[PDB]
Enzyme design. Structure first.
Site, PDB file in Angstrom:
ATOM      1  N   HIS A   1       0.836  -1.187   0.000  1.00 53.08           N
ATOM      2  CA  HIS A   1       0.000   0.000   0.000  1.00 53.08           C
ATOM      3  C   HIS A   1       0.870   1.235   0.000  1.00 53.08           C
ATOM      4  O   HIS A   1       0.493   2.265  -0.550  1.00 53.08           O
ATOM      5  CB  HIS A   1      -0.929   0.022   1.205  1.00 53.08           C
ATOM      6  CG  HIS A   1      -2.020  -0.995   1.135  1.00 53.08           C
ATOM      7  ND1 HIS A   1      -2.562  -1.420  -0.059  1.00 53.08           N
ATOM      8  CD2 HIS A   1      -2.680  -1.666   2.108  1.00 53.08           C
ATOM      9  CE1 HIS A   1      -3.503  -2.313   0.182  1.00 53.08           C
ATOM     10  NE2 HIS A   1      -3.596  -2.479   1.489  1.00 53.08           N
TER      11      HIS A   1
ATOM     12  N   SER B   1       0.695  -0.955  -6.784  1.00 55.54           N
ATOM     13  CA  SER B   1       1.130  -2.078  -7.611  1.00 55.54           C
ATOM     14  C   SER B   1       1.935  -1.707  -8.839  1.00 55.54           C
ATOM     15  O   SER B   1       2.027  -0.541  -9.197  1.00 55.54           O
ATOM     16  CB  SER B   1      -0.086  -2.885  -8.059  1.00 55.54           C
ATOM     17  OG  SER B   1      -0.830  -3.343  -6.945  1.00 55.54           O
TER      18      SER B   1
ATOM     19  N   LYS C   1     -13.215  -7.931 -11.391  1.00 51.11           N
ATOM     20  CA  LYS C   1     -12.189  -8.772 -12.007  1.00 51.11           C
ATOM     21  C   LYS C   1     -11.694  -9.844 -11.044  1.00 51.11           C
ATOM     22  O   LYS C   1     -11.497 -11.001 -11.437  1.00 51.11           O
ATOM     23  CB  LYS C   1     -11.029  -7.903 -12.493  1.00 51.11           C
ATOM     24  CG  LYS C   1     -10.273  -8.486 -13.667  1.00 51.11           C
ATOM     25  CD  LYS C   1      -9.482  -7.412 -14.391  1.00 51.11           C
ATOM     26  CE  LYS C   1      -8.488  -8.019 -15.360  1.00 51.11           C
ATOM     27  NZ  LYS C   1      -7.673  -6.978 -16.040  1.00 51.11           N
ATOM     28  N   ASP C   2     -11.517  -9.485  -9.769  1.00 49.61           N
ATOM     29  CA  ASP C   2     -11.133 -10.458  -8.757  1.00 49.61           C
ATOM     30  C   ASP C   2     -12.254 -11.446  -8.488  1.00 49.61           C
ATOM     31  O   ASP C   2     -11.990 -12.619  -8.218  1.00 49.61           O
ATOM     32  CB  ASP C   2     -10.723  -9.738  -7.474  1.00 49.61           C
ATOM     33  CG  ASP C   2      -9.309  -9.194  -7.535  1.00 49.61           C
ATOM     34  OD1 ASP C   2      -8.736  -9.138  -8.645  1.00 49.61           O
ATOM     35  OD2 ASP C   2      -8.774  -8.805  -6.480  1.00 49.61           O
TER      36      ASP C   2
ATOM     37  N   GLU D   1       5.434 -34.080  -2.654  1.00 46.70           N
ATOM     38  CA  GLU D   1       4.277 -33.715  -3.452  1.00 46.70           C
ATOM     39  C   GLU D   1       4.702 -32.929  -4.672  1.00 46.70           C
ATOM     40  O   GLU D   1       5.842 -32.489  -4.765  1.00 46.70           O
ATOM     41  CB  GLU D   1       3.286 -32.933  -2.599  1.00 46.70           C
ATOM     42  CG  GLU D   1       1.859 -32.960  -3.117  1.00 46.70           C
ATOM     43  CD  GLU D   1       0.840 -32.757  -2.014  1.00 46.70           C
ATOM     44  OE1 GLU D   1       1.226 -32.810  -0.827  1.00 46.70           O
ATOM     45  OE2 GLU D   1      -0.349 -32.549  -2.333  1.00 46.70           O
TER      46      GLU D   1
HETATM   47  C1  HEM Z   1       0.914 -16.134   1.068  1.00 49.08           C
HETATM   48  C2  HEM Z   1       0.638 -15.931  -0.217  1.00 49.08           C
HETATM   49  C3  HEM Z   1       0.563 -14.562  -0.755  1.00 49.08           C
HETATM   50  C4  HEM Z   1      -0.495 -13.715  -0.665  1.00 49.08           C
HETATM   51  C5  HEM Z   1      -1.817 -13.969   0.011  1.00 49.08           C
HETATM   52  C6  HEM Z   1      -0.127 -12.523  -1.325  1.00 49.08           C
HETATM   53  C7  HEM Z   1      -1.031 -11.467  -1.409  1.00 49.08           C
HETATM   54  C8  HEM Z   1      -0.822 -10.439  -2.293  1.00 49.08           C
HETATM   55  C9  HEM Z   1      -1.772  -9.480  -2.679  1.00 49.08           C
HETATM   56  C10 HEM Z   1      -3.204  -9.415  -2.214  1.00 49.08           C
HETATM   57  C11 HEM Z   1      -1.166  -8.640  -3.552  1.00 49.08           C
HETATM   58  C12 HEM Z   1      -1.825  -7.458  -4.218  1.00 49.08           C
HETATM   59  C13 HEM Z   1      -2.574  -7.871  -5.491  1.00 49.08           C
HETATM   60  C14 HEM Z   1      -1.625  -8.295  -6.579  1.00 49.08           C
HETATM   61  O1  HEM Z   1      -0.855  -7.497  -7.058  1.00 49.08           O
HETATM   62  O2  HEM Z   1      -1.633  -9.560  -7.027  1.00 49.08           O
HETATM   63  C15 HEM Z   1       0.171  -9.065  -3.714  1.00 49.08           C
HETATM   64  C16 HEM Z   1       1.094  -8.431  -4.517  1.00 49.08           C
HETATM   65  C17 HEM Z   1       2.452  -8.748  -4.520  1.00 49.08           C
HETATM   66  N1  HEM Z   1       3.039  -9.786  -3.923  1.00 49.08           N
HETATM   67 FE1  HEM Z   1       2.089 -11.172  -2.831  1.00 49.08          FE
HETATM   68  N2  HEM Z   1       1.120 -12.616  -1.813  1.00 49.08           N
HETATM   69  C18 HEM Z   1       1.605 -13.834  -1.511  1.00 49.08           C
HETATM   70  C19 HEM Z   1       2.842 -14.386  -1.825  1.00 49.08           C
HETATM   71  C20 HEM Z   1       3.861 -13.612  -2.347  1.00 49.08           C
HETATM   72  C21 HEM Z   1       5.174 -14.032  -2.524  1.00 49.08           C
HETATM   73  C22 HEM Z   1       5.678 -15.405  -2.176  1.00 49.08           C
HETATM   74  C23 HEM Z   1       5.877 -12.971  -3.070  1.00 49.08           C
HETATM   75  C24 HEM Z   1       7.310 -12.935  -3.406  1.00 49.08           C
HETATM   76  C25 HEM Z   1       7.812 -13.628  -4.421  1.00 49.08           C
HETATM   77  C26 HEM Z   1       4.960 -11.896  -3.230  1.00 49.08           C
HETATM   78  C27 HEM Z   1       5.310 -10.667  -3.739  1.00 49.08           C
HETATM   79  C28 HEM Z   1       4.344  -9.760  -4.164  1.00 49.08           C
HETATM   80  C29 HEM Z   1       4.652  -8.600  -4.991  1.00 49.08           C
HETATM   81  C30 HEM Z   1       6.023  -8.214  -5.472  1.00 49.08           C
HETATM   82  C31 HEM Z   1       3.486  -7.966  -5.220  1.00 49.08           C
HETATM   83  C32 HEM Z   1       3.316  -6.699  -6.023  1.00 49.08           C
HETATM   84  C33 HEM Z   1       2.626  -6.966  -7.355  1.00 49.08           C
HETATM   85  C34 HEM Z   1       2.964  -5.892  -8.345  1.00 49.08           C
HETATM   86  O3  HEM Z   1       2.743  -4.606  -8.042  1.00 49.08           O
HETATM   87  O4  HEM Z   1       3.428  -6.199  -9.416  1.00 49.08           O
HETATM   88  N3  HEM Z   1       3.729 -12.322  -2.780  1.00 49.08           N
HETATM   89  N4  HEM Z   1       0.358 -10.175  -2.923  1.00 49.08           N
END
Ligand code: HEM
Ligand SMILES: CCCCCCCCCCCCCCCCCC(=O)OC[C@H](COP(=O)([O-])OCC(O)COP(=O)([O-])OC[C@@H](COC(=O)CCCCCCCCCCCCCCCCC)OC(=O)CCCCCCCCCCCCCCCCC)OC(=O)CCCCCCCCCCCCCCCCC
Ligand SMILES: CCCCCCCCCCCCCCCCCC(=O)OC[C@H](COP(=O)([O-])OCC(O)COP(=O)([O-])OC[C@@H](COC(=O)CCCCCCCCCCCCCCCCC)OC(=O)CCCCCCCCCCCCCCCCC)OC(=O)CCCCCCCCCCCCCCCCC
Ligand SMILES: CCCCCCCCCCCCCCCCCC(=O)OC[C@H](COP(=O)([O-])OCC[N+](C)(C)C)OC(=O)CCCCCCCCCCCCCCCCC
Ligand SMILES: CCCCCCCCCCCCCCCCCC(=O)OC[C@H](COP(=O)(O)OCCN)OC(=O)CCCCCCCCCCCCCCCCC
Ligand SMILES: CCCCCCCCCCCCCCCCCC(=O)OC[C@H](COP(=O)(O)OCCN)OC(=O)CCCCCCCCCCCCCCCCC
Ligand SMILES: CCCCCCCCCCCCCCCCCC(=O)OC[C@H](COP(=O)(O)OCCN)OC(=O)CCCCCCCCCCCCCCCCC
Ligand SMILES: CCCCCCCCCCCCCCCCCC(=O)OC[C@H](COP(=O)(O)OCCN)OC(=O)CCCCCCCCCCCCCCCCC
Ligand code: HEC
Ligand code: HEM
Ligand SMILES: COc1c(O)c(C)c(C/C=C(\C)CC/C=C(\C)CC/C=C(/C)CC/C=C(\C)CC/C=C(\C)CCC=C(C)C)c(O)c1OC
Lengths: 68, 49, 373, 54, 240, 98, 140, 76, 48
Positions: free
Chosen positions: C194, C198, C220-221, C264
């Site tokens: 936040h 993004s 969309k979600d 797995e």
């Molecule tokens: C536990 C599982 C995870 C959840 C629930 C989660 C949740 C979210 C949510 C809600 C967003 C914002 C919506 C979106 O851009 O898709 C997001 C974005 C992001 N997440 Fe995660 N995430 C998870 C795992 C990860 C992991 C493992 C990484 C690292 C590799 C990561 C890195 C990011 C990044 C870099 C963004 C920014 C997207 C962008 O602006 O391009 N997330 N995540």
């Protein structure tokens, strides 16, 4: 009155095909080989597995239409 | 890193070195004591036992 | 209103880029999957008993006597599989579009990934089948690799000489408690996002074109949630066991080892790497690095362009990386014999060399082609 | 389907396939060196055709 | 490892939206009761489960009252036995694993409750194994209490051919050929390993229908609320 | 090398969105300082080009081929301004080093 | 150095695609070299490099048509499970037709190419299946 | 938040009401061409790694089989 | 046409909800019935 197990009739009908009779020919040679060589540890499983694989593949193609 | 290969940068570190060692020392004492590392604790003159 | 303010700033009006593709759905899907897992896990916890005499009996009682208990159990298992599918695609989106420059978000992400892998491992140990017991011993043994304190650590976790009831019960407690820590870490994740907002697939500053989230990226979600639910229910209701191990339907016999022991589908890439390194310790380390190499990823970005939309050579290297990740997933499955081993050894060498060496050199070359370097 | 698709496919295409093939085979410099070298290539291939099928 | 891989058979419970033939499950339960129950156990299946599958409540009780079961402690504290109840599980053919081991020449007949689920390609395997006691080829020799079943791992299963043509008579009268018996017991064991197979597939049909309705629509609502932007026509008109 | 650079410019694909090369730079601290030092007209054209590229990526479209950015035509406007930012940045760094 | 190509035929079709694709790729490439050679000997180039490029273009294009033919036919056979089926080859021949079409950047050529090349390859399969003899010795 | 995100100038932006415009304007009319346009700009970067994964996978399988296959000459 | 509908049950949100709830109440009856017909017929002769 011998109850014919459709599986048997399907089994020799499937052994009449060509891949099964070629694998049986290797099986024969293989078994003859093992038989001929009195002391050896060369089994015929691979050949036998190939023959059973081809034969039960074409059996499973058409077995279940004869079963109620 | 280009910026970190510097003269004052070196001076700063040299001035910072002693303090750094002290901190490692504190952590070292802690590890020995906390985890009861006994290889090191056993050599201590008094707490032995 | 101080509780509603959060939503307005975060979920209802947050300025989001207008051009983000369907890949940006996946993280929200992960959150939904987390809840789904938690909900299904809670309804497994009202009948599961963490006793080695009764764990398999309780699982069969869930599948056979509880009303729609088979539905909740197979929803939990295939939802773990769906969680790892969405997790891998989320990480691949982050790698492809240069989203790792949000360094705090990336590091909280790789912490979340480690926590999710540990949770899924202990959850797979929980039904106390043949495959669960031999799988647990195996990875717990992984720890013994530690140079000096390894033996103790293994015994600690096991809670005894060898995995036995002592383990099962503490694995039930830890598998229960870690998804709430995952939820808190996800709040910190979205929090650190936040503060930044993004990224977009072009990798450019999208401040000139931002739209609300409520009517544009909410429906969309919702559509992505509906499609993910379609795939999850066709995984549960039609091919439930396609993503399982038949040998887990046998009770745990400490005396015998199921011959075809394998982790797995999601742990395989790691499994391959571990098997590849001859040294036990080496394997463990490489394995860890396999996941950790990602954290290391924001320090390897040497390009003046954030995304790979305008970078074709690094696109080719990225798809080669996805290719040998699929190869490592396949190898893990294959048994120990020629030539599966060599592929595994190369595939691991190619994986680490593409992430560590080839992509920054390619980014330097791409900057040289645009008369920037 | 009549006129264009059934005339572009069978009757016309065969017209074009050839027309184009004659254009490449008959566009020759007329210089002797080029032509001769082609004789060289031929000798080489025929030498091989015999060699490999010895 | 090196093992024969059972072929794919055209079963009926394979159909995406196809349920188990219940007459075949009834016949396979008869096959288990008359042949397989002497050595194999069904610890997680109880008579009540059958009710609504291939038997009625009264019939099931008939089945239940056709077996003997121990009944906890007497008032005197002396364990006693009772007529089987719809709540009773299937009887143990061996009080303890050791008993089975001893009787079955060291082999532990595995509980056939989840055998189909526990064996890779179970339904096929089962059929193949039960119908795959072929003669050992030259070069291989098996000790007593072993049989060359290509499909069985090691091709040396302790169980002997458990199905000789006309081993048991089907009450329905369907000719009891070895195969007809192996197919019935594979269907039954399958049912055993998944009593909900039928109920689930119903939901599946329903789910598809719903997705087939909701998915298309949710898409129309999204494309409504995203049309506005997707028709936006930007234009830069600098002062110039 | 010139023709192969044109082929790589076509393969990169930001010209199909009407972008320049300097529009595709990742906005680090030095890049934002160079963008802040731009004149008003160049900044406004850059923001409009970025907004149009984002809209085209939203609709999954590209510009017509006559409206693409010709490699030869692309202008490296931010470059001059950027070098300075880097130069100044380095000078300051060196001063601190020493 | 001929026992090689022949190998393609020895193992049953649809099996050992790796070898098949390799062999098919070589033949195409060989033809590429020969074709480029005639193309350079006659209708020469302007600079040594320009011609080296040609050779490369023709070689690669031909090698490609070779590969996809080999790959498509082998794979189709395996997937379709028809070990010996003329169609398998046609799918492959068509594939080559398309490749060639792409390398020439022309949909039309792909059309010409899909049918003609495929038909030709199919006929090769039939030829092998029916034991047709090409360039036969005089047996009168 | 909105209002303080960025500074643009003289960029006019026209739009239409959702109910006033067709829901799927020329959906398959141009959708197909575009999807195809898209696939041809990305297929050469994406596909050949997965093609050689397929070749390596098949190769491994076959090679493994041959490895397992028995050599009759071995026993003599 | 829908107009009559809209102005009557789909324009006032309260009525929108009413139509939704009522429809859903009956939809289940219809869906279950129709769906069951399909499933059972597919497996006719195997049920019970
Ligand atoms: C536990 C599982 C995870 C959840 C629930 C989660 C949740 C979210 C949510 C809600 C967003 C914002 C919506 C979106 O851009 O898709 C997001 C974005 C992001 N997440 Fe995660 N995430 C998870 C795992 C990860 C992991 C493992 C990484 C690292 C590799 C990561 C890195 C990011 C990044 C870099 C963004 C920014 C997207 C962008 O602006 O391009 N997330 N995540
Ligand atoms: C092909 C024939 C039809 C055709 O030409 O369609 C053109 C159309 C593209 O038209 P366009 O004008 O070039 O692009 C604008 C989009 O239509 C604008 O729509 P969009 O594609 O951006 O929609 C958002 C996105 C949203 O997608 C998601 O949210 C997907 C979420 C991830 C997948 C699920 C998670 C699990 C993954 C496991 C692996 O939805 C899709 O990609 C398709 C949704 C289809 C729903 C069901 C329709 C029946 O093609 C599609 O939409 C492809 C899918 C439908 C076919
Ligand atoms: C001892 C016995 C020895 C016997 C030796 C026989 C040698 C036969 C070869 C030619 C001999 C010398 C000659 O007169 O060729 C002049 C010919 C003049 O061409 P050029 O002046 O380089 O072309 C002008 C432009 O560059 C043309 O513009 P372009 O190059 O852009 O147009 C081609 C374009 C677009 O291409 C197309 O749309 C048409 C594609 C046609 C493909 C099939 C052509 C050959 C058909 C044979 C039947 O695609 C390409 O750029 C090339 C892509 C890579 C193609 C690789 C194909 C290798 C074919 C090797 C054939 C070997 C003989 C069989 O040189 C060749 O190209 C040689 C290969 C093709 C010859 C033309 C067809 C003659 C076929 C007669 C029957 C042969 C087979 C049955 C016997
Ligand atoms: C899955 C559907 C997700 C819809 C998300 C969304 O955008 O909101 C829908 C729409 C968004 O607004 P809308 O503009 O699409 O439709 C509103 C229709 N009027 C104008 C009449 C209000 O909101 C609603 O439809 C609210 C409906 C409330 C129904 C309450 C009773 C339900 C009874 C169930 C039994
Ligand atoms: C699979 C192929 C998906 C695909 O369509 O590839 C091409 C696509 C092109 O994307 P781009 O060039 O940015 O243009 C998009 C807007 N027209 O490129 C993309 O789709 C990029 C997608 C990024 C995420 C891909 C994730 C694939 C799976 C990765 C798993 C492993 C991730 C790393 C694990 C460590
Ligand atoms: C020289 C290019 C010639 C192209 C001729 C085609 C016609 C071009 C003109 C017409 C336009 C057609 C459509 C254009 C679409 C977009 C442009 C395009 O495709 O460009 C070519 C593309 C990018 O070119 P570039 O990145 O500059 O090449 C460097 C190569 N490394 O490059 C490519 O797509 C080539 C990709 C090759 C990838 C080979 C990978 C081999 C190794 C894979 C290993 C995988 C793992 C193996 C196992 C490991 C463990 C054991
Ligand atoms: C199955 C059915 C297959 C039917 C095949 C039909 C083949 C003939 C169709 C008509 C071909 C034709 O009309 O060729 C004309 C073309 C242009 O030349 P022309 O028309 O003489 O001069 C221009 C006008 N003054 O001249 C040409 O381009 C070449 C003409 C080739 C004539 C047919 C040769 C067939 C060879 C088969 C091998
Ligand atoms: C029945 C047979 C149906 C054949 C297909 C009918 C439709 C053909 C068609 O519509 O295209 C004709 C083609 C159009 O191509 P065009 O867009 O003009 O670009 C040419 C670039 N050189 O016309 C052309 O200009 C290209 C002609 C290409 C001719 C050679 C194509 C490959 C031929 C392989 C023959 C077999 C080789 C092996 C034996
Ligand atoms: C009724 C026709 C059946 C069916 C469908 C099966 N059996 Fe038996 N069985 C017996 C013993 C001693 C064993 C263990 C032997 C060993 O492990 O060496 C088995 C084993 C099985 C299996 C498991 C195969 C596996 O891979 O583990 C299966 C699927 C199986 N059987 C099917 C003993 C007996 C009997 C006493 C003589 C009889 C009767 C049956 N089995 C009957 C059946
Ligand atoms: C706090 C919430 C959760 C609770 C209470 C919970 C509880 C349980 C219980 C009781 C089981 C054993 C029943 C069974 O065999 O399926 C189980 C299994 C499992 N859980 Fe969870 N769980 C929770 C969240 C999660 C999450 C978030 C994941 C994913 C990372 C997960 C992954 C698994 C897996 C893989 C299994 C094994 C399923 C199988 O038998 O195949 N659980 N869980
Ligand atoms: C506009 O930017 C945002 C954003 O503002 C928010 C809040 C989310 C968060 C959305 C979700 C619904 C994911 C839920 C995340 C969690 C906190 C998971 C925790 C789970 C619970 C058990 C609660 C985004 O995904 C997002 O980008 C699309």
């Amino acid at each position: 009155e011998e109850l014919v197990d459709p599986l048997t009739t399907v089994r020799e009908h499937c052994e009449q095909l060509e891949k099964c009779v070629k694998a049986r020919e290797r099986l024969e040679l293989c078994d003859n080989r093992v038989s001929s060589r009195s002391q050896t540890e060369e089994d015929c499983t691979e050949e036998l597995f190939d023959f059973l694989h081809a034969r039960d593949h074409c059996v499973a193609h058409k077995l279940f239409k004869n079963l109620k | 890193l280009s910026r970190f290969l510097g003269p004052r940068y070196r001076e700063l570190a040299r001035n910072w070195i002693p303090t750094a060692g002290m901190w490692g020392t504190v952590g070292a004492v802690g590890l020995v004591w906390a985890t009861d590392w006994r290889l090191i604790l056993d050599w201590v003159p008094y707490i032995n036992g | 209103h101080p509780l509603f303010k959060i939503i307005n700033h975060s979920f209802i009006d947050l300025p989001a880029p207008s051009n983000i593709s369907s890949w940006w759905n996946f993280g929200s899907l992960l959150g939904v999957c987390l809840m789904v897992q938690i909900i299904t896990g809670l309804f497994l916890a009202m009948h599961y008993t963490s006793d080695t005499m009764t764990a398999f009996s309780s699982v069969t009682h869930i599948c056979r006597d509880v009303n729609y208990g088979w539905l909740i159990r197979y929803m939990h298992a295939n939802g773990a599989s769906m969680f790892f599918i969405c997790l891998f695609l989320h990480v691949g989106r982050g790698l492809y579009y240069g989203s790792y420059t949000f360094m705090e978000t990336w590091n909280i992400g790789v912490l979340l990934l480690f926590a999710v892998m540990a949770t899924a491992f202990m959850g797979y140990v929980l039904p106390w089948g043949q495959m669960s017991f031999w799988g647990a011993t195996v990875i717990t043994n992984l720890l013994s690799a530690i140079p000096y304190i390894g033996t103790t650590l293994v015994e600690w976790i096991w809670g005894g000489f060898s995995v036995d009831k002592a383990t099962l019960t503490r694995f039930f407690a830890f598998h229960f408690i870690l998804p709430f820590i995952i939820a808190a870490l996800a709040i910190v994740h979205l929090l650190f996002l936040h503060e930044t907002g993004s990224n977009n697939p072009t990798g450019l500053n999208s401040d000139a074109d931002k739209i609300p989230f409520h009517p544009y990226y909410t429906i969309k979600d919702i559509l992505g949630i509906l499609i993910m639910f379609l795939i999850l229910m066709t995984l549960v209701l039609f091919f439930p066991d396609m993503l399982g191990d038949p040998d887990n339907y046998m009770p745990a016999n400490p005396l015998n080892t199921p011959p075809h022991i394998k982790p797995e589908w999601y742990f395989l890439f790691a499994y391959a790497i571990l098997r590849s390194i001859p040294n036990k310790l080496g394997g463990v380390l490489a394995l860890i690095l396999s996941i950790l190499i990602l954290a290391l990823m924001p320090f390897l970005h040497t390009s003046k362009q954030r995304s790979l939309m305008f970078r074709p050579i690094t696109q080719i290297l990225y798809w080669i990386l996805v290719a040998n990740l699929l190869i490592l997933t396949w190898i893990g499955g294959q048994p120990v014999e020629h030539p599966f081993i060599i592929i595994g050894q190369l595939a691991s060498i190619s994986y680490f060399s593409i992430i560590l060496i080839l992509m920054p050199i390619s980014g330097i070359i791409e900057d040289k082609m645009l008369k920037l370097y | 389907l009549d006129l264009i698709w059934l005339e572009k496919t069978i009757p016309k295409s065969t017209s074009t396939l050839h027309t184009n093939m004659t254009t490449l085979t008959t566009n020759q410099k007329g210089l002797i060196k080029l032509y001769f070298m082609s004789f060289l290539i031929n000798i080489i291939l025929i030498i091989i055709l015999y060699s490999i099928n010895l | 490892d090196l093992e024969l891989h059972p072929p794919s058979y055209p079963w009926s419970h394979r159909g995406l939206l196809s349920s188990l033939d219940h007459t075949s499950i009834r016949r396979g339960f008869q096959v288990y009761k008359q042949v397989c129950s002497s050595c194999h156990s069904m610890d997680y299946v109880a008579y009540r489960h059958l009710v609504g599958v291939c038997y009625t409540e009264e019939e099931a009780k008939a089945l239940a009252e056709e077996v003997e079961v121990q009944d906890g402690p007497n008032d005197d504290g002396e364990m006693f036995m009772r007529p089987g109840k719809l709540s009773d599980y299937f009887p143990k053919p061996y009080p303890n694993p050791e008993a089975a081991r001893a009787a079955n020449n060291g082999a532990l007949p595995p509980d056939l409750s989840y055998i189909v689920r526990a064996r890779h390609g179970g339904e096929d395997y089962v059929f193949s194994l039960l119908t795959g006691y072929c003669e050992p080829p030259t070069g291989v020799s098996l000790r007593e209490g072993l049989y060359f079943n290509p499909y069985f791992p090691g091709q040396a299963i302790g169980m002997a051919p458990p199905i000789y043509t006309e081993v048991l008579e089907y009450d329905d009268g369907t000719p009891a050929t070895m195969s007809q018996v192996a197919k019935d017991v594979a269907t039954f064991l399958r049912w055993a390993s998944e009593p909900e197979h039928d109920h689930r597939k119903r939901m599946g049909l329903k789910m598809l229908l719903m997705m087939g309705l909701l998915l298309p629509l949710t898409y129309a609502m999204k494309r409504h609320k995203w049309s506005v932007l997707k028709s936006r026509k930007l234009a830069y008109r600098p002062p110039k | 090398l010139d023709g192969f650079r044109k082929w790589y410019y076509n393969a990169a694909g930001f010209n199909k969105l009407g972008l320049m090369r300097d529009d595709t730079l990742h906005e680090t601290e030095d890049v934002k300082e160079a963008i802040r030092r731009l004149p008003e007209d160049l900044y406004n054209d850059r923001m409009f080009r970025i907004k149009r590229a984002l809209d085209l990526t939203m609709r999954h479209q590209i510009l017509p081929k006559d409206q693409w950015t010709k490699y030869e035509e692309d202008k490296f406007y931010l470059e001059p301004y950027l070098k300075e930012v880097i130069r100044e940045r380095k000078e300051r760094e060196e001063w601190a080093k020493k | 150095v001929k026992r090689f190509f022949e190998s393609y035929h020895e193992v049953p079709d649809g099996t050992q695609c790796h070898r098949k694709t390799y062999i098919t790729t070589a033949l195409g490439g060989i033809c590429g070299i020969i074709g480029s050679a005639y193309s350079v000997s006659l209708n020469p180039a302007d600079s040594t490099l320009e011609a080296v490029a040609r050779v490369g273009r023709y070689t690669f294009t031909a090698a490609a048509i070779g590969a996809m033919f080999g790959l498509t036919t082998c794979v189709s056979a395996q997937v379709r499970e028809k070990p010996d089926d003329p169609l398998n080859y046609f799918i492959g021949g068509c594939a080559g037709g398309l490749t060639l079409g792409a390398r020439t950047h022309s949909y039309g050529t792909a059309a010409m190419g899909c049918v003609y090349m495929g038909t030709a390859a199919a006929l090769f399969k039939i030829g092998k299946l029916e034991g047709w003899e090409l360039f036969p010795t005089p047996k009168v | 938040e909105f209002g303080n995100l960025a500074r643009i100038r003289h960029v006019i932006s026209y739009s239409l009401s959702p109910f006033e415009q067709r829901a799927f304007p020329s959906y398959f009319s141009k959708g197909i061409p575009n999807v195809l346009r898209r696939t041809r700009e990305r297929i050469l970067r994406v596909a050949p790694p997965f093609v050689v994964v397929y070749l390596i996978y098949t190769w491994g399988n076959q090679e493994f089989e041959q490895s397992k296959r028995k050599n009759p000459a071995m026993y003599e | 046409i829908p107009s009559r509908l809209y102005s009557l049950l789909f324009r006032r949100t309260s009525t929108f909800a009413l139509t939704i709830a009522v429809g859903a109440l009956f939809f289940e009856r219809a869906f279950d019935q129709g769906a069951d017909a399909i499933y059972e017929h597919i497996n006719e002769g195997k049920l019970w």
